[PDB]
Amino acid sequence: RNKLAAAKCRNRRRELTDRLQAETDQLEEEKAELESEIAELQKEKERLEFVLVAH
Amino acid sequence: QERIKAERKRLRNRIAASKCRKRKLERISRLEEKVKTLKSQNTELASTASLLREQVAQLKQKVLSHV
Ligand code: NA
Numbered sequence: 091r092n093k094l095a096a097a098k099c100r101n102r103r104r105e106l107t108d109r110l111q112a113e114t115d116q117l118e119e120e121k122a123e124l125e126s127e128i129a130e131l132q133k134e135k136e137r138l139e140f141v142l143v144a145h
Numbered sequence: 146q147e148r149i150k151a152e153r154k155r156l157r158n159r160i161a162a163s164k165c166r167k168r169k170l171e172r173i174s175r176l177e178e179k180v181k182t183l184k185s186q187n188t189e190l191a192s193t194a195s196l197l198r199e200q201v202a203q204l205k206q207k208v209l210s211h212v
Contacts (some may be wrong), residue, residue, distance in 0.1 A: 092153040092161070099165035110146070110176035117183035131197040138204035145211070 094156050095161045096164070099161070101180065102165065102191070103169065107176065108175055109182060110173060110180060112178050114176060114183065117180060117187060121183060121186050121190065124187060124194055131194065131201055134201050135197060135204060138201060138208055142204060142208050142211070
């Protein structure tokens with residue numbers, strides 16, 4: 091019957107974990123998008139190479 | 146002994162506080178490590194992307210050169 095201790099615990103000095111967690115989010119998304127554009131750029135590379143040998 | 150029980154409560158509180166600090170510092174440590182790893186990964190990916198762009202630019206250039 092001490093959940094209050096945990097709640098107020100995770101409420102004290104939230105700025106740090108808040109900033110680190112947000113930066114973590116921005117970096118996770120930046121990563122995902124980078125992987126996507128790498129995929130697309132690779133597809134374009136394959137396309138250009140095929141076009142470059144078929145004509 | 147109405148007071149000793151309050152000293153016990155005091156000790157319990159100080160323990161809870163201590164545990165809180167330990168958990169918080171551990172979480173901050175994990176997060177910092179995470180942000181570091183992600184930053185390294187995003188740097189490598191960003192490099193890969195850049196290089197791929199360069200390659201695509203050259204291929205496109207050559208393709209146009211043969212039109
Ligand atoms: Na494609």
